Design a protein around this nucleic acid. Structure first.
Ligand SMILES: [Mg+2]
Ligand SMILES: [Mg+2]
Ligand SMILES: [Mg+2]
Ligand SMILES: [Mg+2]
Ligand SMILES: [Mg+2]
Ligand SMILES: [Zn+2]
Lengths: 135, 83, 221, 102, 88
RNA sequence: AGGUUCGAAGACGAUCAGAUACCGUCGUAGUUCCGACCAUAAACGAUGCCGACUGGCGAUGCGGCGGCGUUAUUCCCAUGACCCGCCGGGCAGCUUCCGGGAAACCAAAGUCUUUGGGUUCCGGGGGGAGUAUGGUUGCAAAGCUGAAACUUAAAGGAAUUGACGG
């Protein structure tokens, strides 16, 4: 009750995680020793407050991609972003469904009579336009 | 649109407007040859007619006056004439 | 163009019809009615693809006219287009801002991310109104991808395709990149581009994990 | 200065509307200005529904509703906390409050 | 009407709807049409029948209100009175 | 004529330091109808009337026109109920760096120092005062028309920050 960490602890822990992710783990005491020897923290209480938040943040990172950013998480992010170009295109449907109105649009721009272009009938209807007011 | 051309409108925009407010005003009404079954002659009923018109030979009703347009009676051919 | 070389070449018509890119209803903005063909019986407006193609080519001309390639700035607030603008900047050499646009990027000269571009290309006028307004502050011309109901306030080279579906957004960024690189000399314009347009498509996390587990179970078996 | 564009009432195309009486103080309010409220509360007051249900002589009986329409003057609606003061841009919002369904 | 020992024999005196049903039917954005007729049966039991009916929203209707115009209300009311009179 | 209910006046009961008040009980005139007066209201959109021009959007009411379909009689053409649009005249709404404005705001309160479409009424610091007096209308109550002496350095409008709010 009343254990919110200030922005000094939070941003110090974030920079520590960003720079020295490889030497930290989910153990408070080894993280405490690492933060002792890689940063000049003037007081013991601040030191192990920072170490506690580092431990909490590494549990969060081991769950998923919080900020961040780890090099492994970011390289796998750009791997997902860059790779999975599929082996077959998603736009090669080989059967394209068209309204007869779009068929006529293509017909008047000289492409409506050489493509595959499977056509349906128009929907008897005009029941768009969700009812006005409440219910 | 800043460069709408006001003196060459498309015919659909011309038909869409009021009968005034066109470049040159023109009526939306017309005349027509109305033919009823059982007779031989035709009558030249106005489209927006207000009179209960009658065929002079056979005293039968051709059109019934309504709010905007004369409603012709049960089945009778009509030919809009000279457009 | 009026040239025969800059004509439609119906392979991309098949790409357009597969992705969407011609269905934009049901609201029509009064400055976008120049680009529609007509309205479907179910309320959707149909967009004439000749106008889309030639507005795209005009935009590509304007992008090519910038001598320094890292002065075109490409913007996408939404994710469906964040991927496309990142790959577009990779292909052409533009400068992307994918995600949150911090206000004062173009006007506050003191701050660190003070970009000073010469052209601005925007996925959605309605979702990227803040870069449009700042472009009005710093006399910066603007190109945008516009649906049938997108307001054209600070837009100059509005390209009327579609910006709801992920496929249409990825496809139009793909063809903008292809035309920009073809007007410069990188692709000889006779054989198709090696980059397949699925590279620019948005992928939500659930279908990503479904695809990756399907690929894992296929590879192990 | 003029506080609202309508003058606190729905009177647009007419000269006079008939007054009504406020339901808990009997002030004369014009009908378009009054705070109206429709109440479809249960008679049997669902904190006590099970005792009535088990004491009933029928097997399948559905409890009747109570249908009252309330009219408030502005002062009674404010004091009974039917409505509250809002800021300017909040004032010009006409949506009913959400139905708190879940 | 009469007593037969330990029995009270009754006869019809009137019909009514419950309060909650009548309050449940009346709602906004529709027109209520009511009619009444005074009318005598063959054996001399002069009655007063009250009718009520409400305009119905169509299933594909997207307008909020279903309001009959005044002439429609008048001929609906005329039909109600003529049907009740011919029935009783 | 009629007087159910409410209810100026009035009486009482409370509350209060007081309480000719607010709250409660009763209750006259009045409230209702017919006939005759009176001419006033925050009689308000606090915005003269007529005409022209200048953005968008979605609805709504009346009339007309045109369209896939659904529904009613009836099996058809009408005619109704709905659906999708267009035109005209209405009551309004949202939005907009049209433009305006001291601003609140206003698509009119815009098209105004880049000042002139036609025309009626009307203001000229605050008070004294809509008073005095004369005239005139009315049964009266009052309405209309309407000063001066004298007095005064501000009275006001719209926004901002605080302080205060039973
Ligand atoms: Mg006030
Ligand atoms: Mg009034
Ligand atoms: Mg009393
Ligand atoms: Mg009186
Ligand atoms: Mg003065
Ligand atoms: Zn009250």
């Amino acid at each position: 009750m009343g254990r919110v960490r200030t922005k000094t602890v939070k941003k110090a822990a974030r920079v520590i995680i960003e720079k020295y992710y490889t030497r930290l783990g989910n153990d408070f005491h080894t993280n405490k020793r690492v933060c002792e020897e890689i940063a000049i923290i003037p007081s013991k209480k601040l030191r192990n407050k920072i170490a506690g938040y580092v431990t909490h943040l590494m549990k969060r990172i081991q769950r998923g991609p919080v900020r961040g950013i780890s090099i492994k998480l970011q390289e796998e992010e750009r791997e997902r972003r860059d790779n999975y170009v599929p082996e077959v295109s998603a736009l090669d449907q080989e059967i394209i469904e068209v309204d007869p109105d779009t068929k006529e649009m293509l017909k008047l721009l000289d492409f409506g009579s050489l493509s595959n272009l499977q056509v349906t009938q128009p929907t008897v209807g005009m029941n768009f336009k969700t009812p006005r007011g409440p219910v | 649109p800043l460069a709408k051309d006001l003196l060459h409108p498309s015919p659909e925009e011309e038909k869409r407007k009021h009968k005034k407010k066109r470049l040159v005003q023109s009526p939306n009404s017309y005349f027509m040859d109305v033919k009823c079954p059982g007779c031989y002659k035709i009558t030249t009923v106005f489209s927006h007619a207000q009179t209960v018109v009658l065929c002079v030979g056979c005293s039968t009703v051709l059109c019934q006056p309504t709010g905007g347009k004369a409603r012709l009676t049960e089945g009778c051919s009509f030919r809009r004439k000279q457009h | 163009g009026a040239l025969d070389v800059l004509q439609m070449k119906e392979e991309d018509v098949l790409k357009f019809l597969a992705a969407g890119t011609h269905l934009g209803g049901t609201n029509l903005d009064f400055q976008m009615e120049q680009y529609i063909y007509k309205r479907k019986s179910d309320g959707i407006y149909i967009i004439n693809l000749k106008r889309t193609w030639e507005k795209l080519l005009l935009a590509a001309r304007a992008i090519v006219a910038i001598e320094n390639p890292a002065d075109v700035s490409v913007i996408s607030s939404r994710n469906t287009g964040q991927r496309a603008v990142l790959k577009f900047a990779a292909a052409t050499g533009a400068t992307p801002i994918a995600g949150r646009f911090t206000p004062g990027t173009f006007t506050n000269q003191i701050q660190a991310a003070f970009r000073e571009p010469r052209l601005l290309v925007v996925t959605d006028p309605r979702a990227d109104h803040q870069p449009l307004t700042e472009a009005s502050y710093v006399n910066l011309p603007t190109i945008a991808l516009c649906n049938t109901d997108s307001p054209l306030r600070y837009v100059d080279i509005a390209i009327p395709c579609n910006n709801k579906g992920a496929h249409s957004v990825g496809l139009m960024w793909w063809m903008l990149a292809r035309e920009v690189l073809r007007m410069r000399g990188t692709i000889s314009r006779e054989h198709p581009w090696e980059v397949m347009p699925d590279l620019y498509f948005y992928r939500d996390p659930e279908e990503i994990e479904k695809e990756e587990q399907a690929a894992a179970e296929k590879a192990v078996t | 200065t003029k506080k609202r564009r309508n003058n606190g009432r729905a009177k647009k195309g007419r000269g006079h509307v008939q007054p009504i009486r406020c339901t808990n103080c009997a002030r004369c309010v014009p009908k378009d200005k009054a705070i109206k409220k429709f109440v479809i509360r249960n008679i049997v007051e669902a904190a006590a529904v099970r005792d009535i249900s088990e004491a009933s002589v029928f097997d399948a009986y559905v409890l009747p509703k109570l249908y009252v329409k309330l009219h408030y003057c502005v002062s009674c609606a404010i004091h009974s906390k039917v409505v509250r003061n809002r800021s300017r841009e909040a004032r010009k919002d006409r949506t009913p409050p959400p139905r708190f369904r879940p | 009407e009469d007593v037969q020992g330990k029995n009270c024999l009754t006869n019809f005196h009137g019909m009514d709807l419950t309060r909650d049903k009548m309050c449940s039917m009346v709602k906004k954005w529709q027109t209520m049409i009511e009619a009444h007729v005074d009318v005598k049966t063959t054996d001399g039991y002069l009655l007063r029948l009250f009718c009520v009916g409400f305009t119905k929203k169509r299933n594909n209707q997207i307008r909020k209100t279903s309001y009959a115009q005044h002439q429609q209300v008048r001929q609906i009311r005329k039909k109600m009175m003529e049907i009740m009179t011919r029935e009783v």
